[PDB]
């Protein structure tokens, strides 16, 4: 019943910047208002209770204010470990309600990926499928181009990527690209290469192996 409106839905800022997030309640909720922080893969954790009080253990760069309908959460000096989504929640009514959340992203300097390639295991080939894996480790920004070449033939439509969330310590990403073939097709070619383009690389980086060798 009591609708909470949170804005912005996302923001990005550099380490040390001041970050402000807003929560608006549809009716007066006095100071019955909590803020939570949710990191990737984890349950949310309370940071602020009764609108303006820091949970014990929380760093003092966090604060909150507001009474009535308008509330703000402030980070005075954004830190890498503050990468998370923040939620407000009203406790005025027994029917609890949440704001929509604000995702906080961290801007940092460019970092080039370390590139690794893994041939399929002999165990997997017995099952009839070959997975070839290219790893881009610890880079920034997230945008990257990964191209598979088989015997210098640009591949299309037979690979899938996965990318991590920003690292809580160094704010980098890691990415995988998986080329999936039949054992049959895999054994018809020799050179397997993933080629990486990224802002932090002056020219594309290529990692490759030769089947069997």
């Amino acid at each position: 019943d009591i609708q909470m409106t949170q804005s912005p839905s996302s923001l990005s800022a550099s380490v040390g910047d001041r970050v402000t997030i807003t929560c608006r309640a549809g009716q007066n909720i006095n100071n019955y208002l909590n803020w939570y922080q949710q990191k990737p893969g984890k349950a949310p954790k309370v940071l602020i209770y009764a609108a303006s009080n820091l949970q014990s253990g929380v760093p003092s760069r966090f604060s909150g204010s507001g009474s009535g309908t308008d509330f703000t959460l402030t980070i005075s000096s954004l830190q890498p470990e503050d990468f998370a989504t923040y939620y407000c929640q009203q406790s005025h009514s027994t029917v609890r309600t949440f704001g929509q959340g604000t995702k906080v992203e961290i801007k940092r300097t460019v970092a080039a990926p370390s590139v690794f390639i893994f041939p399929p295991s002999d165990e997997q080939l017995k099952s009839g499928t070959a997975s070839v894996v290219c790893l881009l480790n610890n880079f920034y920004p997230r945008e990257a181009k990964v191209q598979w070449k088989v015997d210098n033939a640009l591949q299309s439509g037979n690979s899938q990527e996965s990318v991590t969330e920003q690292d809580s310590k160094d704010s980098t990403y890691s990415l995988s690209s998986t080329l999936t073939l039949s054992k049959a097709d895999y054994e018809k070619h020799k050179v397997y290469a993933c080629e990486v383009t990224h802002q932090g690389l002056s020219s594309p980086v290529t990692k490759s192996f030769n089947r069997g060798e």
């Binding site: 939570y36 949310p44 939620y87 406790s91 029917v95 609890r96 949440f98 894996v133 996965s162």
Partner: protein, 219 residues
């Protein structure tokens, strides 16, 4: 410090009901204000309902009676049942304690602490299937890993050496393959000088299929 432990992930067919359990231990009280919250993939927290220490329930109207919270005081356990499941109900279901934690200014203030670890309920008619685990075999820094292929539903957890190896680990979000099954890799960067001396084992757990597999990854 009370701790809340939930039942495991599972797939449920559309139209069926799911019952998720929340078991409390380690506190000083015999019953608690327990609330239930869910989070669909890429969505926010959505409050569902709660139960008081004397077992009065309150439900958000938006669920239209599909939610029932019950208690078994003998086991210190709270249950949330969500009925008439549809694919939009796929979500991590969380319990939490919502107790009074502070009073000031003439008022008392409730908040969610601690939380259960969450229970991923996948609404689908596809069958459970455990994963196959393959090694990603490795001067300077080396990379090695485990490829965890062809399982359903989410989730899979991966640790290295039981969780004793955490530095340099990246466990990638699962990808849905066109076969309808999930796949994922977990990798770790280690000093190359350690290869052939240090043992590296990935522990893969797919609770929905009761699959616990270890794979030693060697060069």
């Amino acid at each position: 410090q009370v701790q809340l432990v939930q039942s495991g992930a599972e797939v449920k067919k559309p139209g069926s009901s799911v019952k998720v359990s929340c078991k409390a231990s380690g506190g000083t009280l015999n019953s608690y204000e327990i609330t239930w919250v869910r989070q669909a993939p890429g969505q926010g927290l959505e409050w569902m309902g709660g139960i008081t220490p004397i077992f009065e329930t309150t439900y958000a109207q938006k669920f239209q009676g599909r939610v029932t919270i019950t208690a078994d005081e003998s086991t210190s356990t709270t249950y949330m049942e969500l009925s008439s499941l549809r694919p939009e109900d796929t979500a991590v279901y969380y319990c939490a304690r919502d107790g009074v934690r502070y009073c000031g200014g003439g008022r008392c203030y409730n908040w969610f602490d601690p939380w259960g670890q969450g229970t991923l309920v996948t609404v689908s008619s596809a069958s459970t299937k455990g994963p196959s685990v393959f090694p990603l075999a490795p001067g300077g820094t080396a990379a090695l890993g485990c490829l965890v292929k062809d399982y359903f539903p989410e989730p899979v957890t991966v640790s290295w050496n039981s969780g004793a190896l955490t530095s340099g680990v990246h466990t990638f979000p699962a990808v849905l393959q066109s076969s309808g099954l999930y796949s994922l890799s977990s990798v770790v960067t280690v000093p190359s000088s350690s290869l052939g001396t240090q043992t590296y084992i990935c522990n893969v757990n797919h609770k929905p299929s009761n699959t616990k597999v270890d794979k030693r990854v060697e060069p």
